[PDB]
Amino acid sequence: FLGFLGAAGSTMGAASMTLTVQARNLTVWGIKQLQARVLAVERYLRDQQLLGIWGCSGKLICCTNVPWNSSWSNRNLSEIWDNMTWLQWDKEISNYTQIIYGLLEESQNQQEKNEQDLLAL
Amino acid sequence: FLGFLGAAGSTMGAASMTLTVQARNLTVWGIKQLQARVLAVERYLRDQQLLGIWGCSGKLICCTNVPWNSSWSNRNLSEIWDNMTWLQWDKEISNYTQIIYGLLEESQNQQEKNEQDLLAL
Amino acid sequence: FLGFLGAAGSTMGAASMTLTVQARNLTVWGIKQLQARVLAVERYLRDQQLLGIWGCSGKLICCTNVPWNSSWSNRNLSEIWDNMTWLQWDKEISNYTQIIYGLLEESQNQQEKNEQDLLAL
Amino acid sequence: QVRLSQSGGQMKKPGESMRLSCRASGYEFLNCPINWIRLAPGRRPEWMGWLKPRGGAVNYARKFQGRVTMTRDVYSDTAFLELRSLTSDDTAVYFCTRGKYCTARDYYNWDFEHWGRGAPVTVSVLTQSPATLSLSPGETAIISCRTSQSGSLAWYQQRPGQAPRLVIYSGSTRAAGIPDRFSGSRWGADYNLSISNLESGDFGVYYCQQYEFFGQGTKVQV
Amino acid sequence: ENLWVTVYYGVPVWKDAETTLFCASDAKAYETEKHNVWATHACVPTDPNPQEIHLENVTEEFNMWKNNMVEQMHTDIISLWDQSLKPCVKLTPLCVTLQCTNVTNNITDDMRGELKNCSFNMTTELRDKKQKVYSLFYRLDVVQINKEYRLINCNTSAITQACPKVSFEPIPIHYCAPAGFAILKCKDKKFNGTGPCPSVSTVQCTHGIKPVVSTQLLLNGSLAEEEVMIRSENITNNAKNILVQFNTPVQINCTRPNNNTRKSIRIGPGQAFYATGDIIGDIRQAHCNVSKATWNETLGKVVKQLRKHFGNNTIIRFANSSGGDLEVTTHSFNCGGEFFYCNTSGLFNSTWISNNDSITLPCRIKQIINMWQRIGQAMYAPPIQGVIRCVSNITGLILTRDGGANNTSTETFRPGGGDMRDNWRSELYKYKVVKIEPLGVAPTRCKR
Amino acid sequence: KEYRLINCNTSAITQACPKVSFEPIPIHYCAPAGFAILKCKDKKFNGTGPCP
Amino acid sequence: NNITDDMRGELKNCSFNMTTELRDKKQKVYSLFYRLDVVQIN
Ligand SMILES: *[C@@H]1O[C@H](CO)[C@@H](O[C@@H]2O[C@H](CO)[C@@H](O[C@@H]3O[C@H](CO[C@H]4O[C@H](CO[C@H]5O[C@H](CO)[C@@H](O)[C@H](O)[C@@H]5O[C@H]5O[C@H](CO)[C@@H](O)[C@H](O)[C@@H]5O)[C@@H](O)[C@H](O[C@H]5O[C@H](CO)[C@@H](O)[C@H](O)[C@@H]5O[C@H]5O[C@H](CO)[C@@H](O)[C@H](O)[C@@H]5O)[C@@H]4O)[C@@H](O)[C@H](O[C@H]4O[C@H](CO)[C@@H](O)[C@H](O)[C@@H]4O[C@H]4O[C@H](CO)[C@@H](O)[C@H](O)[C@@H]4O[C@H]4O[C@H](CO)[C@@H](O)[C@H](O)[C@@H]4O)[C@@H]3O)[C@H](O)[C@H]2NC(C)=O)[C@H](O)[C@H]1NC(C)=O
Ligand SMILES: *[C@@H]1O[C@H](CO)[C@@H](O[C@@H]2O[C@H](CO)[C@@H](O[C@@H]3O[C@H](CO[C@H]4O[C@H](CO[C@H]5O[C@H](CO)[C@@H](O)[C@H](O)[C@@H]5O[C@H]5O[C@H](CO)[C@@H](O)[C@H](O)[C@@H]5O)[C@@H](O)[C@H](O[C@H]5O[C@H](CO)[C@@H](O)[C@H](O)[C@@H]5O[C@H]5O[C@H](CO)[C@@H](O)[C@H](O)[C@@H]5O)[C@@H]4O)[C@@H](O)[C@H](O[C@H]4O[C@H](CO)[C@@H](O)[C@H](O)[C@@H]4O[C@H]4O[C@H](CO)[C@@H](O)[C@H](O)[C@@H]4O[C@H]4O[C@H](CO)[C@@H](O)[C@H](O)[C@@H]4O)[C@@H]3O)[C@H](O)[C@H]2NC(C)=O)[C@H](O)[C@H]1NC(C)=O
Ligand SMILES: *[C@@H]1O[C@H](CO)[C@@H](O[C@@H]2O[C@H](CO)[C@@H](O[C@@H]3O[C@H](CO[C@H]4O[C@H](CO)[C@@H](O)[C@H](O)[C@@H]4O)[C@@H](O)[C@H](O[C@H]4O[C@H](CO)[C@@H](O)[C@H](O)[C@@H]4O)[C@@H]3O)[C@H](O)[C@H]2NC(C)=O)[C@H](O)[C@H]1NC(C)=O
Ligand SMILES: *[C@@H]1O[C@H](CO)[C@@H](O[C@@H]2O[C@H](CO)[C@@H](O[C@@H]3O[C@H](CO[C@H]4O[C@H](CO)[C@@H](O)[C@H](O)[C@@H]4O)[C@@H](O)[C@H](O[C@H]4O[C@H](CO)[C@@H](O)[C@H](O)[C@@H]4O)[C@@H]3O)[C@H](O)[C@H]2NC(C)=O)[C@H](O)[C@H]1NC(C)=O
Ligand SMILES: *[C@@H]1O[C@H](CO)[C@@H](O[C@@H]2O[C@H](CO)[C@@H](O[C@@H]3O[C@H](CO[C@H]4O[C@H](CO)[C@@H](O)[C@H](O)[C@@H]4O)[C@@H](O)[C@H](O[C@H]4O[C@H](CO)[C@@H](O)[C@H](O)[C@@H]4O)[C@@H]3O)[C@H](O)[C@H]2NC(C)=O)[C@H](O)[C@H]1NC(C)=O
Ligand SMILES: *[C@@H]1O[C@H](CO)[C@@H](O[C@@H]2O[C@H](CO)[C@@H](O[C@@H]3O[C@H](CO)[C@@H](O)[C@H](O[C@H]4O[C@H](CO)[C@@H](O)[C@H](O)[C@@H]4O)[C@@H]3O)[C@H](O)[C@H]2NC(C)=O)[C@H](O)[C@H]1NC(C)=O
Ligand SMILES: *[C@@H]1O[C@H](CO)[C@@H](O[C@@H]2O[C@H](CO)[C@@H](O[C@@H]3O[C@H](CO)[C@@H](O)[C@H](O[C@H]4O[C@H](CO)[C@@H](O)[C@H](O)[C@@H]4O)[C@@H]3O)[C@H](O)[C@H]2NC(C)=O)[C@H](O)[C@H]1NC(C)=O
Ligand SMILES: *[C@@H]1O[C@H](CO)[C@@H](O[C@@H]2O[C@H](CO)[C@@H](O)[C@H](O)[C@H]2NC(C)=O)[C@H](O)[C@H]1NC(C)=O
Ligand SMILES: *[C@@H]1O[C@H](CO)[C@@H](O)[C@H](O)[C@H]1NC(C)=O
Ligand SMILES: *[C@@H]1O[C@H](CO)[C@@H](O)[C@H](O)[C@H]1NC(C)=O
Ligand SMILES: *[C@@H]1O[C@H](CO)[C@@H](O)[C@H](O)[C@H]1NC(C)=O
Ligand SMILES: *[C@@H]1O[C@H](CO)[C@@H](O)[C@H](O)[C@H]1NC(C)=O
Ligand SMILES: *[C@@H]1O[C@H](CO)[C@@H](O)[C@H](O)[C@H]1NC(C)=O
């Protein structure tokens, strides 16, 4: 272990070795902490809601049936996990993040679980 | 897609095509929003807690081993999903909602997971 | 059913028959309740986060691949579930709770799901 | 730091009345009661009464009721005492005391960790043994006290011409500044105070205490 | 054969802790107009159906003397008293010289005036004109200097008038705990207030506890179940108060004979002071009656329980209060808005050795009070029209024992209870706060 | 002729600050998560009853 | 003090009226203030 955000400067594959550590910790002047610790759990549940609506719910890692479009910075498998950091990576895919999100939440668990609805009728 | 609450006036089967969209978005005068957004996540986690104690946890849809009592508005499969809205439906079953809830939370995951307890000893 | 905390004085095995009932319910002078009901959901999500990082996520019960060390009050299978209450039990294992927690969160889902990472590359 | 500042001593005549003051500082006045205890030479210590700074509530001893009056000034944190119809029996050194444990939540009155300097006034059970103890520096002094009621017992040390200092409370627990050389033990109704490796400062007179009752005292000299 | 760890969520596991409790009142308490009666308005309505669960086989240790609910309730009512007086009328320009005289009566001189007819200058709505108006005040409210008088609180603190809209009448209050926590209740016949409890039950909200401010006597208190109960943190300690709980309630009647007139003088512009006008009828003093028979039996039932802790064959004497502030020495309470202070030398005047009318007690009235040993806040209780009558239950005592006894082997008890936290300990002895930790791991032959 | 302020036997008085302005501002009222606001878009909705 | 005049006072011994606890009576009390705290008029 390297503590919180330990492998931030490490490759994404090596940064995958420390995923559980960063999710773990995450009268006036007394309200300063209240208004903040409320937004903290809202930022948490915003992330868990997104994690739930997708084909995930179960945290840490999960698979999805969405093909990677080449326009989203066409890199190779060994050129990503062994030659790039998450900070450097999120910077490139930042443009397409809002787009990918829409394809995970709508195209998947709305059509995938609906498969079972046709099997349930 | 038809946006939030899109298929409200559509049949329950057709309204099942838009389940993910409604779960996604869901000094004084500044406390007006705080006391409200606190009640929002309490209203959210109340639904997720109920969704967790039942044979669900995983959101959207899930199966249960509870037989539909005929006294609960005896309708046919094709007379429900293709001839009734969720608004029109919940109005009839409103009387038995509290009853069914007790059968999902107590009779199921308390006895169903206890099966594994006898298998674990 | 025996209501909230019903089988507290019953054996741990008999107390396993009532697990779902205790998880279900769980201008000044008006802030007295707000500051409290905020700590309530924080105490809840602290437990749900710990429940998520481990090999659980799904509530109530779950298995783990962690061997029971004999130094942790070496008792027998039949000497625990049929001769001890949860209150009496937690009092002995209280010394090793922080230790066990570290082995569930770190050694497991950080190495167990990482297995899939080597299978995903 | 907790400090009890007493007014000086005085000489009175029989029949007259006397008054003493005691200004507390270093803590919140309203938290815990103040006590008044008289010490006469070669006599069992007498607890007269206590006063709560709260509502000015008081509780005296049988012996003094109708003669004694305790009041206080919350604003100046000063406690007042009055005793009427003075007789030669009244002659003694009067102290104001405060318990050790004294928080906002609760307190324990009778572990007197804090003592005023005392006021010498002249007008003109617990079985403690031995009465006296002549020992050399380096030896070990064993003072004994037999009770009959049980309850947090304390040990005090009085140096020649100085105010008594809390040495031990609860029968086995040392107070602040007390070295390992002082130790307490208990067996049934019996209580033992053991002082190992005697030195100049240790010599004086020692008292055992159970609430408002005191022992007859044990004088340890060089 | 080798065991494996398994996580359980929702197990009956709790630990003693402290949290922020919220309030609860019955619906009818909101439904009654009340206008203002404490801060009960923001309070959550009580669950119509009571929910309780008897924990079989469970034995939990209680401690009424180390209970945090008492401290929280104390500060809650304290902050409540301030919030109830913040938007009220402040009486800063009422510290003018008072040219007072005796009230209209025919007195030998043993009545010692008590009531004073004060005349003084006052600020009207306009800045320019003075106002020569007269009022009526109790002797305990005024003090002469160097006949000219002044308000008794002038070198103490500032002063604010209680609003006529608000009421000090006690309301049943239920204290509840948030999610993740629970309140334990001892349901024993004879729980003397400390240690392990055989029959333990759980509750979300406690029963209706009326926050009655009183000293010495547990006025409008509550009863015990079998034999009268005696609770003390340390009985051998005479510095610790001894809280007594009765089985049968003692019927007492307190009245204010002086039918009064409210005079509404306007300090201005929108602020009005209420002054006592002239009395109509006879000049009599407030008093309280205690059924002699009921009190004799009740004392006789208590003295039989006191022997169980101070020896079977001993003498128990009752004597009045030794001294102190007027509120502690007398029986302090509220009735109909006015604050009475009654002489309890007629109740603790007994001597019990070897095991048809009412007892009346002289009662004084103060309008200027400073309870809870409040600093910087003095409240003036406005005059109340009509004869005030109140009938209540004495269900307990707060006694103190005299020390340095040794020789006689006898005990004398005097009324005390200066601190008001003891008044709450008489209702919260059965309740305590615990936190639920539903996460419990346990080994079994279960692997993936 | 001697006069006085009209509010003297009514109430106290406080002066509006010259910094502040009473000019109406467009205000949008919104609902938190879990709630929603319904809007009638009818040509002739006379203010009560069902909306098409 | 005993000052040549280069000390420029600095410290001032001011006397004034004051409101007591009672409304009616004025209070003639004196205090001490720094020159930077006070300013003379006319
Ligand atoms: C209400 O409620 C409440 C609650 O809920 C309650 O309360 C209560 O109260 C009471 C009164 O106050 C109390 O009682 C008390 O107690 C105490 C304590 O107890 C405990 O302990 C014990 C022991 O002790 C010890 O130890 C401990 C530990 O272990 C500690 O802590 C302590 O402190 C002590 O210590 C000491 O000692 C030691 C040695 O020993 C040393 O080391 C040290 O240092 C010190 O010194 C125990 O034991 C107990 O237990 C018991 O009991 C049970 C039942 O209960 C059982 O089961 C068990 O088993 C046991 O038994 C045993 O013992 C006995 C005796 O005791 C015997 O008999 C038998 O057989 C057996 O063996 C517990 O745990 C105590 O201490 C006390 O006692 C005392 O006192 C009495 C009177 O009061 C008497 O009677 C007795 O007898 C005793 O006396 C004695 O002792 C003392 C001292 O202590 C002295 O002073 C005297 O003199 C005498 O002496 C004798 O003895 C000795 C010994 O043996 C000898 O040596 C000599 O020589 C002589 O002989 C009391 O008891 C309680 O506790 C409470 N509880 C609670 C829970 O908290 C109430 O009550 C109610 N109320 C109503 C009305 O009901
Ligand atoms: C805006 O918007 C809004 C909303 O959105 C609107 O609102 C509106 O308003 C209006 C006005 O105001 C209204 O109207 C009215 O209404 C009423 C009610 O209605 C209902 O009901 C009915 C019945 O009635 C009854 O019943 C019920 C239950 O069932 C109840 O509730 C009631 O109250 C009543 O009761 C009564 O009676 C009974 C018997 O009957 C008894 O038992 C009791 O006791 C009492 O007495 C019903 O019917 C209706 O329905 C109807 O309609 C529908 C459509 O609409 C249809 O679909 C159906 O089917 C029906 O029809 C039927 O009927 C008719 C009649 O009515 C006929 O014709 C036909 O054919 C059929 O058969 C409903 O549901 C009412 O009442 C009224 O009426 C009346 O009035 C009027 C005027 O106003 C007239 O015209 C009429 O005619 C009538 O009259 C009559 O009657 C009366 C009484 O009532 C009288 O008085 C008179 O005289 C007359 O008489 C006659 O008749 C009778 C009977 O038959 C006889 O017997 C006799 O002899 C004679 O002949 C009115 O209509 C409404 O409602 C509302 N709506 C809502 C939603 O709300 C507004 O409008 C707007 N605006 C604008 C501008 O736009
Ligand atoms: C901060 O950033 C620096 C530089 O960017 C990182 O340093 C690099 O770390 C990586 C590991 O993640 C290194 O890659 C590995 O090097 C190992 C060591 O090389 C051995 O052999 C050479 C030659 O004899 C000697 O230096 C020495 O004897 C070493 O023992 C190799 O053993 C590794 O190969 C093995 O592991 C891989 C898996 O990683 C297997 O797939 C292989 O089959 C093989 O078994 C590997 O090559 C790299 O060399 C380091 N230097 C660089 C890149 O310049 C820090 O790790 C990084 N730190 C943090 C905290 O982020
Ligand atoms: C608001 O409410 C209105 C009325 O209640 C709804 O309108 C109904 O919509 C349903 C669909 O949900 C319609 O049902 C379907 O009609 C289709 C169209 O019919 C075709 O053929 C006729 C005759 O030639 C012509 O009108 C035209 O050529 C159409 O192309 C059918 O094709 C459908 O059948 C097929 O689909 C079903 C699945 O739904 C399959 O199971 C079948 O095997 C088949 O392949 C179907 O019958 C209905 O006709 C509409 N009108 C009514 C009920 O009066 C709105 O949809 C609704 N809107 C919202 C947003 O809620
Ligand atoms: C509070 O605490 C008390 C005591 O600690 C508990 O009482 C014990 O409860 C346990 C059950 O949890 C009892 O154990 C069971 O006793 C049953 C009754 O015994 C029968 O037979 C005897 C002899 O003829 C008679 O008394 C009577 O006819 C009874 O009908 C047995 O039937 C049980 O055996 C069966 O069940 C077990 C599973 O539990 C199976 O594995 C067996 O194969 C068998 O089929 C069992 O022995 C115990 O006897 C009670 N008394 C004690 C321990 O002294 C309370 O239950 C507890 N309450 C709460 C709410 O916690
Ligand atoms: C107004 O107040 C005055 C007070 O000055 C009062 O006059 C007083 O009346 C009392 C009696 O009511 C007088 O006291 C008397 O003293 C003599 C001795 O000097 C006694 O002998 C008298 O005893 C008789 O009266 C008692 C009263 O009931 C009986 O109980 C007893 O059996 C005897 O019959 C009595 O104690 C007092 O001297 C006068 N004082 C003066 C200055 O006159 C007056 O009555 C009051 N009037 C009203 C209308 O209130
Ligand atoms: C109170 O304040 C007065 C101020 O008026 C002060 O009297 C003054 O004393 C000073 C010296 O302390 C005098 O200054 C002198 O001026 C003459 C020229 O006129 C010089 O020759 C003097 O020089 C001698 O003294 C110096 C001071 O130490 C030496 O350093 C030098 O070597 C010389 O020996 C000196 O500068 C001033 O004239 C008077 N002023 C008046 C009005 O008398 C007085 O001393 C103060 N007293 C107290 C008790 O504070
Ligand atoms: C206190 O007052 C109550 C009523 O205000 C008294 O109760 C009354 O007792 C008489 C008997 O003398 C009955 O005739 C009445 O019917 C009772 N009234 C009620 C309302 O029950 C009580 O006796 C008084 N007690 C004391 C000590 O003064
Ligand atoms: C991939 O991205 C391009 C834009 O560069 C877009 O035209 C194309 O439709 C995308 N692929 C899919 C399957 O949508
Ligand atoms: C179904 O509902 C009826 C009431 O109409 C009830 O009597 C019956 O018990 C219910 N079925 C079951 C399985 O409980
Ligand atoms: C079990 O506990 C002992 C301490 O008693 C420790 O030495 C040992 O390493 C533990 N077992 C494992 C597998 O860590
Ligand atoms: C837990 O540890 C403490 C000291 O750290 C020890 O006193 C206690 O006995 C231990 N618990 C058990 C069940 O042995
Ligand atoms: C006094 O009470 C404390 C705690 O309430 C207890 O520890 C102590 O033993 C008691 N003393 C006596 C003499 O009972």
Side-chain angles (χ1 to χ4, degrees), chain E residues 106-160:
Chain E
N106 171 80
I107 287 170
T108 311
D109 277 343
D110 284 342
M111 296 293 289
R112 292 184 180 176
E114 296 303 321
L115 295 170
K116 287 292 185 178
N117 191 3
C118 309
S119 298
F120 52 92
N121 277 285
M122 178 60 73
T123 301
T124 60
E125 276 150 33
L126 307 177
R127 194 145 177 91
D128 43 86
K129 287 254 161 133
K130 300 297 183 181
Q131 193 177 180
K132 192 67 176 299
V133 283
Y134 79 104
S135 175
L136 183 62
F137 302 106
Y138 300 85
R139 182 180 180 274
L140 299 173
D141 296 322
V142 299
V143 170
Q144 67 182 343
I145 55 172
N146 192 29
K147 298 297 183 181
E148 49 187 9
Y149 289 78
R150 82 166 208 271
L151 292 185
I152 193 169
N153 61 29
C154 283
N155 79 75
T156 65
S157 60
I159 178 178
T160 168

Side-chain angles (χ1 to χ4, degrees), chain A residues 70-81:
Chain A
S70 300
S71 59
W72 305 340
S73 180
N74 47 270
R75 302 276 189 174
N76 203 321
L77 202 281
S78 186
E79 301 177 10
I80 294 174
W81 302 92

Side-chain angles (χ1 to χ4, degrees), chain E residues 202-213:
Chain E
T202 55
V203 288
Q204 188 67 25
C205 307
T206 65
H207 65 269
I209 298 184
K210 293 181 179 180
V212 178
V213 168

Side-chain angles (χ1 to χ4, degrees), chain D residues 14-31:
Chain D
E16 298 180 351
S17 309
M18 63 171 284
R19 290 165 163 169
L20 295 177
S21 55
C22 179
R23 294 185 181 176
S25 63
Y27 72 102
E28 292 179 350
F29 198 52
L30 296 176
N31 281 18

Side-chain angles (χ1 to χ4, degrees), chain F residues 44-52:
Chain F
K44 297 171 300 175
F45 182 52
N46 85 86
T48 30
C51 177

Side-chain angles (χ1 to χ4, degrees), chain E residues 168-215:
Chain E
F168 307 101
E169 172 86 0
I171 299 194
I173 297 194
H174 305 252
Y175 295 91
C176 304
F181 300 84
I183 298 170
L184 304 184
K185 180 176 183 178
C186 203
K187 194 188 178 63
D188 263 7
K189 287 311 128 197
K190 298 171 300 175
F191 180 52
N192 84 84
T194 30
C197 177
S199 63
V200 176
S201 60
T202 55
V203 288
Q204 188 67 25
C205 307
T206 65
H207 65 269
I209 298 184
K210 293 181 179 180
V212 178
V213 168
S214 62
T215 57

